[PDB]
Amino acid sequence: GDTIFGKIIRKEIPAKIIFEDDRCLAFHDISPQAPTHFLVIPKKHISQISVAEDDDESLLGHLMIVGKKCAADLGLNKGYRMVVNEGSDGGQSVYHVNLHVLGGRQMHWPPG
Template sequence: MKKSFCFRGSAAKRAGRTPMADWCVFCDIARRAPASTTALLYSDDKVVAFQDINPSAFRHYLVIPIEHIPTVKNLQRTNEDHQLVSHMVKVGKDLLSQDAPESEEHRFGFHQPPFNSIDHLHLHCLALPFIPSWRQVKYTPLGPLGGFIDVEKLLEKIKPETEVYSQ
């Protein structure tokens, strides 16, 4: 079995980050491995974006960090993680505004374990309607069970704590 290189920087050494397993399809996409045929819609030094292989909506894109971060559970209340997710959202919104300007409703979020299909953080960027309509179930929060977490809720959860200094 082929082993794929995973972009693991210093952030991977922080608590909650784990090295990738023997193989990660999203790491192959992010590093543009020869075996990957996925066409990138966007790329920079932090993230790449591409169409979902099994779209659930009129437009359905994934934005993934180049660094291997397994799931939303590995994100922490740090400026770095908050800025990364904010950047992922900006990329997704920009793509949808270019490719689906007629869509009046968008949804942005992440599946939470055990409901995530791939252990590499990926933001779902959806220009609705869902196609077919029953697919909306996959993108619904399930309360204490997890399910899908809206990006705004996640950003609030990982927002860095600000220190208040008294004088």
């Protein structure tokens, strides 16, 4: 079913958009866990990484390339952490695939 991230893609509710193309959208997370914390999501509604199809491989990599380019544009020259959550144990909060990018502070270990 639809999620709040679908509404964001459709521009029905506001978000602070960082980057957009024909197949993905990057925007700041509304509940930031670091001084910079944004999401990169595909426009295709893949609900979770566990159901991603083989044909989605380059799209998923595109999310990471967009994410790293956005991180550089946002000044994260000391580094950052990328996260994808799956399911209950993964703490996934929205059932639309989303790549978190967090930086601007030391990220710790374990990663949750």
